UniProtKB/Swiss-Prot annotation:
The active site is at D35, S199. Disulfide bonds join C255-C290. Belongs to the peptidase A1 family. The keyword Hydrolase applies. It catalyses: Hydrolysis of proteins with specificity similar to that of pepsin A, prefers hydrophobic residues at P1 and P1', but does not cleave 14-Ala-|-Leu-15 in the B chain of insulin or Z-Glu-Tyr. Clots milk. Its EC number is 3.4.23.22. GO terms for molecular function: aspartic-type endopeptidase activity. The chain holds residues 90 to 419 of 419 of the full protein. The gene is EAPA. GO terms for biological process: proteolysis. Coiled coil: none annotated. This is Endothiapepsin. Residues 17-328 form the Peptidase A1 domain.
């Protein structure tokens, strides 16, 4: 089997992407944030504290003839941005782009933190990291991908995120019309539960490539590109007036600037992030100070190849017995 679903930016800045997901019988369609940096599929629901719901579409398990309470199971997750959610668990039928999994753990939120409430466009998350990170207790549950894997034509999914435009998540096949050139594959460590790999270096604008190993994660659920302070300083040094602001919480730059591109290495191959992808707009409405899309990972503890990087590529998440990651230009 295969599946194919369109993923759409939630706003004009590509702060996140939502993908429609069918849950239950009859189908209840929710728009979920596909997140290769976590491993829980959770949704706003009829159980969510009412004051914490503001515009989201909810899953109502009592209206699904295939929903079954997973007795005794609870979940609780906290993300790198300090947000969180928790609740109980149902199993139900879940379909993405025509690909159907029966008995999928659907984690129903009883509580969500303010940033989730405040984002009316995101009805929940669909985790696509390794199932070892799944938070369900006392019996850990599998991700949608893990459940679908054996049924797929090939044990892969691909992320093709758009810049200020829709893109595609495919399951079980590689669309050879969706990228240019070849796909370069690189090794993955699953030791931390992430799609963790090592970039071979970087360049700033038309500058020379610096060969240096950068260990990090491919994370569709993180907006920006977080890299070591040395790398990030080298980038912003090429933008007149750019500076790191502790009050704003990162590098900012004059909105009048033209940003240079940023290249990252995948083996001997190179992925080029156009300068415009690194502009996240005014820090506040009407400001002429703009927020940078490349930020320091110092004190996160991990480098993160988030959407800024991934949207510049066609990305293969290869879930074979020995997982690997593939990147192509597009």
């Amino acid at each position: 089997s295969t599946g194919s679903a369109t993923t759409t930016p939630i706003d004009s800045l590509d702060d996140a992407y939502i993908t429609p997901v069918q849950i239950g019988t009859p189908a209840q369609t929710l728009n979920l944030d596909f997140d290769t940096g976590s491993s829980d599929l959770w949704v706003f629901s009829s159980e969510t504290t009412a004051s914490e719901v503001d515009g989201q579409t909810i899953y109502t398990p009592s209206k699904s003839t295939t929903a079954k309470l997973l007795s005794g199971a609870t979940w609780s997750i906290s993300y790198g941005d300090g947000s969180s959610s928790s609740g109980d668990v149902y199993t139900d039928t879940v379909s993405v782009g025509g690909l159907t999994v029966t008995g999928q753990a659907v984690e129903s939120a009883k509580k969500v933190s303010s940033s989730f409430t405040e984002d009316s466009t995101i009805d929940g998350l669909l985790g696509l990291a390794f199932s070892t990170l799944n938070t369900v207790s006392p019996t850990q549950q599998k991700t949608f991908f893990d459940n679908a894997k054996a049924s797929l034509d090939s044990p892969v999914f691909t992320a093709d995120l758009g810049y200020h435009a829709p893109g595609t998540y495919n399951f079980g096949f590689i669309d050879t019309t969706a990228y240019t050139g070849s796909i370069t594959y690189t090794a993955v460590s699953t030791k931390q539960g992430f799609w963790e790999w090592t970039s071979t270096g970087y360049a700033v604008g038309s500058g020379t490539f610096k060969s240096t190993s950068i260990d990090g994660i491919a994370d569709t659920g993180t907006t920006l590109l977080y890299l070591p302070a040395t790398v990030v300083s080298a980038y912003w040094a090429q933008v007149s007036g750019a500076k790191s602001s502790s009050s704003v919480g990162g590098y900012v730059f004059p909105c009048s600037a033209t940003l240079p591109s940023f290249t990252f290495g995948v083996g001997s191959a190179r992925i080029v992030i156009p300068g415009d992808y690194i502009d996240f707009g005014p820090i506040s409405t009407g400001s002429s100070s703009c927020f940078g899309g490349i930020q320091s990972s110092a004190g996160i503890g991990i480098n993160i190849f988030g959407d800024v990087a991934l949207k510049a590529a066609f990305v293969v998440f290869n879930g074979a017995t020995t997982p690997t990651l593939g990147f192509a230009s597009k």
